[PDB]
């Protein structure tokens, strides 16, 4: 199903076509409100002057049973400020972008982290960037550190002299917990 259709290498960089390097990345974490890492890309990917400036959301997880939510505006959300937006990877509540060599490649987050609580329904809607909001819940114990990325690119969005930015999500997970008190 759409959960797992990994057959494309899709070699790409973090900055993509933008020439901005990691020294000038606008690195600010997802908001923390009642155990919810949210970094909504609303109004942060619109065409604007002095760009494209790469915007990176860093989610550092060190607690069990963590909920992570990411929002990207859809096409036509506001008049002529979100056209030609692209979402990478196309299946990104489950398939995630990982780093081998010096490239970003798609992989299944279930394989990287066991016990991922994928919610197929979020707010009675589908869980994908096709809705614009992605939702999943992390397990309470993680054996080893895992890093994966999500991409919300607005470089192709322009309005005369204005151009859109590029949105990146970096989720950084450290080991925590020992075991679950229960059955298997």
């Amino acid at each position, epitope marked *: 199903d759409e959960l797992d259709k990994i057959d494309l290498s899709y070699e790409t*960089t*973090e*900055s993509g076509d933008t*020439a901005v*390097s*990691e*020294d000038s*990345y606008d*690195k600010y974490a997802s908001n923390n409100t009642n155990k919810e890492y949210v970094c909504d890309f609303t109004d942060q990917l619109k065409p604007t002057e002095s760009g494209p400036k790469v915007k990176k959301c860093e989610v550092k997880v060190n607690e069990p049973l963590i909920k992570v939510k990411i929002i990207c505006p859809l096409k036509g959300s506001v008049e002529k400020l979100y056209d030609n937006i692209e979402y990478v990877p196309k299946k990104s509540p489950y398939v995630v972008l990982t*780093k081998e*060599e*010096t*490239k970003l490649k798609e992989k299944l987050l279930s394989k990287l982290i066991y016990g991922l609580l994928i919610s197929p329904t979020v707010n009675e809607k589908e869980n994908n960037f096709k809705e614009g909001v992605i939702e999943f819940t992390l397990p309470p114990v993680v054996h080893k*550190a895992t*890093v994966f990325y999500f991409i919300c690119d607005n470089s192709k969005t322009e309005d005369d002299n204005k151009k859109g930015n590029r949105g990146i999500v*970096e989720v*950084y997970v450290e080991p925590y917990g020992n075991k679950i008190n229960g059955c298997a």
Partner: antibody
Amino acid sequence: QVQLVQSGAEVKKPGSSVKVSCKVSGGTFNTYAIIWVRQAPGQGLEWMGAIIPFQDRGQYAQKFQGRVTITADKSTSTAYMELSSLRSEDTAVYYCAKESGRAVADRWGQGTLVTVSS
Amino acid sequence: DIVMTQSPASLALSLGERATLYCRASHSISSWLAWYQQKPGKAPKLLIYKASTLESGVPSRFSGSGSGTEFTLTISSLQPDDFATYYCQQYKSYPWTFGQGTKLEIKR
């Protein structure tokens, strides 16, 4: 802002081990790979290995096994290398580099010189 | 590993002349090639970080091109600070490699 610093040149006897110190100042350390290259004078450069600091599992060239060792320590933001069982022709300049997110090594260190003559 | 058959070995030119570097590959590869500049006693400095794009601060006379089995780097005109030894590196695969290098001789 980012800058790379390497140790000084060192001379070692054959059969000994040589250690090269690497430090990454500025940017961030965990989520970018640090690569190593050496070059015999008058000839082309040779790639040796790389590591991503958040994972201690590094990888090396298919031709070089065992002798080359690359490790990372996020507490000091360092990428030390240990090379063991040195032999002739190892007298070469050693270079360090890291990738800036554009899939290519964008920054290189000052370099180190190694001599192995008896 | 990916072989860097960089040609030629040396180039003798004067100020204001045109220089055209080349770096072929063992097999067809889509982009992911970089050119490094190095004078005697310098660290290899990155000037071109992709097929044709340039790093911040790199002069505009540099221009990269080519894809697949052949790549071409063309310098429109040489200035007093443009003579060095140049190398080409591929990173499509993890085992990176470097070429033999090209020399830029001053005057003839």
